[PDB]
Structure 1
């Protein structure tokens, strides 16, 4: 069995420019547990990116949160790049600020 990751990029508290927050990248529903997940600022990977401990849901599918501390600004653009075996190439998902 393979299952494709459900990616959702978002923030801990609602974004307000020039107030520090957390940028989250929640990846779920994927199998196997081998997965690459990066945060990006303006295209470049962010350093000091922590993540949760691998776990799974009652339906056996895995989930990982990968968070970071950030301060959002009107010019800056934060993404999440995820790589997995179900994917043709890395998948990018842009932070929408309302999704």
Structure 2
């Protein structure tokens, strides 16, 4: 209820090194709706990201999905970086690769 974004990062399919996949970042629970959500590989923005049309939950708080096609590499670090006016600094969320 603080109106900061709550964020999680997950792959579309169970991940395997070198197998094409999609990386998702879902931010929810925030207000106002303006938000920067950026998928990052080793500190570099991922190309080809797509964002969902602005929508909201039954409690009126806003949410957005960002996703990008990617081929996960062991020894790369993937993250979702979020900027929002409730946040003093950008917040980052690491993807747990599950391999």
TM normalised by structure 2 equals 0.93
Partners of 1:35 and 1:74 lie apart in 2 by 30
1:6 equivalent in structure 2 = 6
- For structure 2, the 5+ residue unaligned runs are none
2:38 equivalent in structure 1 = 38
2:97 equivalent in structure 1 = 97
Verify the 8 A CA contact 1:25 1:39 in the aligned structure 2. yes
Q: State the 4+ residue runs in structure 1 displaced beyond 2 angstroms.
A: none
2:59 equivalent in structure 1 = 59
TM normalised by structure 1 equals 0.93
Verify the 8 A CA contact 1:40 1:46 in the aligned structure 2. yes
Corresponding position: 1:76 with 2:76? yes
